[PDB]
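Cross-posted from the bioinformatics board.
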Amino acid sequence: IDELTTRKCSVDARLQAENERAERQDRGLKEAETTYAKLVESQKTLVDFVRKEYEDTKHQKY
Amino acid sequence: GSFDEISQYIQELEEERRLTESSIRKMEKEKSDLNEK
């Protein structure tokens, strides 16, 4: 019974610790998947002034 | 370029999140096995 109680404590200690370890990454990824939308706008923004730099040269050609 | 590389690693981390949950649920089943015995 002590062996099983130690097994129960060993399982329960990892059980709750893994839940906290998983949820801290999971909730962090929820902001990270939201950051993907920001990265979608970031890709939109970065290419925007790249074409503006092209347009900075393009209208000079006119 | 950084938009895709970061997002791709997010999916891999999200894949690990499901893997951690599977171990968590199995640990509860292992705990239930200990409880029954």
